[PDB]
Each structure stands twice: as structure tokens, then as C-alpha cells.
């Protein structure tokens, strides 16, 4: 009976970038509730003007939440390359939506290191747009069967960040929420407070 944005932004724990969470309607997109979490940077909404979002209607709205590090926040954008952009979360080049990222060193960092947030390091192919990969197969440096053995020329495809409060901003955790505005040939379910 309303758009529960807090459930995505006020959530206690975000998902790892290789297993990014998706949530998706029938509601009023009152985006002001997101400011309880302060403005950050680079809304970088592509194809969508956010000051018009309060008087626009869409079929659905997809909130993809995860956590990466600082110097990778720039990869969450159409047509970007890199570790996260190729092997974890891929945005399409015709992406009509927004990306809201903010520092969370206060939330996702512990003195011993938050090794719960993980990211994919090896993959034989680059990810298609909005494609999730939760594989655990050990990649082999070469063309051989590790048979699960993680060691010589046989690498665990996932690595942990290990966020600590003492890291630089380029290595500090950042919470990311990607908002995809789905306009299908169907009745609109999410309207702005001004319709």
C-alpha cells in the first residue's frame, strides 16, 4: 500500500556483490524517505530525470542492493569495465535508471575485518546485463580439472574484502542501490506523490 524503500536502505545487512539482492510495486514512490540516509554522490541517473520522478508512473521498480569498495563505485554504470563490472554486477548500456551509492565504513567494517562481503575474482566470460553468478567452481589457471582442489593453478572464484575502519576511502565499504525503472506495456503500479 506504499513503496517500502527503507527495507532496501535501512536494511541491517546488504548482500555481497556476486550475490546482489533484487527487490521489486503497487505504490507511491515517495523518495524523500531515502534522505533519512543523507544524500551522497553521483545519482548519475541515466535516461531518467529524478526531479520528474515524483510526477511519473512506471510498471515496476527494481532495487538491486549490494556492497563494494570505494574505487569500484565508478564501475556501477553503463559501459564500464573492471572486476565488479565484468564478473559481479553488469548494467546494460541502455540502462534507464539510477545508482545511489554511499560510504558505509560505519556499518560494514569491523576492527578484525568484515570478510562476509565477497566478490568474484575469476570467470571465463564477462557477465551479461543484470546477470547474477553464484558459482563456486574452482577456476584453474589453464585447462585442467582441479576437482575441487583449491591451490596450484586452481583458484577460488570468490574473494573476501575484509573491511576495516582503518582503510582508505578507496578501500572502504560502499553500499550501492541500483534503481531500474521498468516501463512495460502494462498498467503502471508505482507513481510519484504527484502522479
Amino acid at each position, epitope marked *: 500500500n506504499l513503496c517500502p524503500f527503507h527495507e532496501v536502505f535501512n536494511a541491517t545487512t546488504f548482500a555481497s556483490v556476486y550475490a546482489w539482492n533484487r527487490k521489486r510495486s503497487n505504490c507511491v514512490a515517495d523518495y524523500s524517505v531515502i534522505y533519512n540516509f543523507a544524500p551522497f554522490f553521483a545519482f548519475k541517473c541515466y535516461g531518467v530525470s529524478p526531479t520528474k520522478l515524483n510526477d511519473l508512473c512506471f510498471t515496476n521498480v527494481y532495487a538491486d542492493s549490494f556492497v563494494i569498495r570505494g574505487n569500484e563505485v565508478s564501475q556501477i554504470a553503463p559501459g564500464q569495465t573492471g572486476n565488479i563490472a565484468d564478473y559481479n554486477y553488469k548494467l546494460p548500456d541502455d540502462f534507464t535508471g539510477c545508482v545511489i551509492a554511499w560510504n558505509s565504513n560505519k556499518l560494514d567494517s569491523t576492527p578484525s575485518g568484515n570478510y562476509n562481503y565477497r566478490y568474484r*575474482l*575469476f570467470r*571465463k566470460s564477462k557477465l551479461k546485463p543484470f546477470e547474477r553468478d553464484i558459482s563456486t567452481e574452482i577456476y584453474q*589457471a*589453464g*585447462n*585442467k580439472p582441479c576437482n575441487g582442489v583449491a*591451490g*596450484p*593453478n586452481c*583458484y*577460488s572464484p570468490l*574473494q573476501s574484502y575484509g573491511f576495516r575502519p582503518t582503510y582508505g576511502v578507496g578501500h572502504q565499504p560502499y553500499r550501492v542501490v541500483v534503481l531500474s525503472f521498468e516501463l512495460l506495456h502494462a498498467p503502471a503500479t508505482v507513481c510519484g506523490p504527484k502522479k
Partner: antibody
Amino acid sequence: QVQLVQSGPEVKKPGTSVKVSCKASGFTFSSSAVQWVRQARGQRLEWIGWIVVGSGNANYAPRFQERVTITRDMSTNTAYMELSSLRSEDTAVYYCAAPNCSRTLCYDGFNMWGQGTMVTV
Amino acid sequence: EIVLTQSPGSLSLSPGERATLSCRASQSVRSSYLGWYQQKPGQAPRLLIYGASSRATGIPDRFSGSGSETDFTLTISRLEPEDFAVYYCQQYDSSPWTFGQGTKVEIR
């Protein structure tokens, strides 16, 4: 011209800690991995240990697991090996090897090799 | 540790005839993670064959390798003057990656 160039020879009194480094050039560094071996003048080769530059995981030989530290700096494409508590018999020529790895696939054998740097104690 | 037995310790042979070098594994090694290296005197080693039987790039056809589970063999068809060096076998199977003692070849 893919190659692996390392530093010159160092000569350090016993008891100190020595730092050796290999800088790679011409190929995708992060995909490959670097193995570190040593050979004494007139003797066979001995395997110190290997590290994965992309993952950062380092595996050492049981003999020298406590006294070696194998690290890597990915910004300068360099692999470092540090030896602590240098003992007089540790004098030897040290080599670093790595397969010719492109971005997609990796060469199945240690194609490239370092020039070999001597260390006297 | 996987002990690598190297036989013979020395090999004196005239250039031209067949050369056979044996690398024996303490226990079975998957014939894929294995490489042969030639160290010339006062030089860095250089890879010849990987996967026991697959010839690497830049090596003439005269060198060949026979692969098994425990036995590994390197055969030189035609000995050349610059092919007189020390030969080491290495396994990448289980750490530590031990090296063979090395079979030195000489002759004129």
C-alpha cells in the same frame, strides 16, 4: 616482447633481511602467478614458494615457510620475496618464473623466467 | 613432499644418438602439472615441455616427452652441440613443487 626483469644483486651481512623483486612487462600480470626458486652454485634448484598476484594467496615450501614472505604490488606489476634471518649457506642465485598469461587464457607452463639475482651472505 | 628421483646422475654420450632421461615420482602425479627445464651453465632455466607430452613453443621437434602416472621420460632424437646442459623435472601437482637432482649430459 613479454619479459620478467628483476633487480640487480644484493650482498648483505648475516642476520639482516633481504628484499627481492621481479617486475613483469608485456602481458597481463593479474591473470598469471609467480613462482620463486633458488639455486646454489653447483647444486640443483630448490623451490621457495609461489604466489598468485590476482588473488594474493601465497604458498611457501615447508623448509622456508616461516622465514619467507612473498607479497605482490599490482599497481607496479611487481612480485616481492623477503628473506629474514639470512644464514651463511643461504647464498644462492634466486629466480622468479611465470607463465605467459593473456587476459582470457593462460599458458600451461612456466614460459617466462627471471634473469637470476645472486645473494651473498 | 614428493621426492623426485633422477637417473642417471651423470650421462656421458656422443652427439647424434638417442637420449633418454627418466624422472621418477615418489607417488603418482597427474601427468598434466609437470614441466621439463633446461638450465645451461651460468644461465636461467628455460621450459621445453609441459603436460609430459606437449611440446612448448619455440622448441624443435627433436625433443619429445613420454608421460605416465609415476614414470616420466624425456627423449632427444638428435643431440645438438648447444643441447648439452642440465635437465630438471618439476611437478605442479602437490605443494611443495620439488625439483629433480638434474641429469648432466656431456660427451668429443
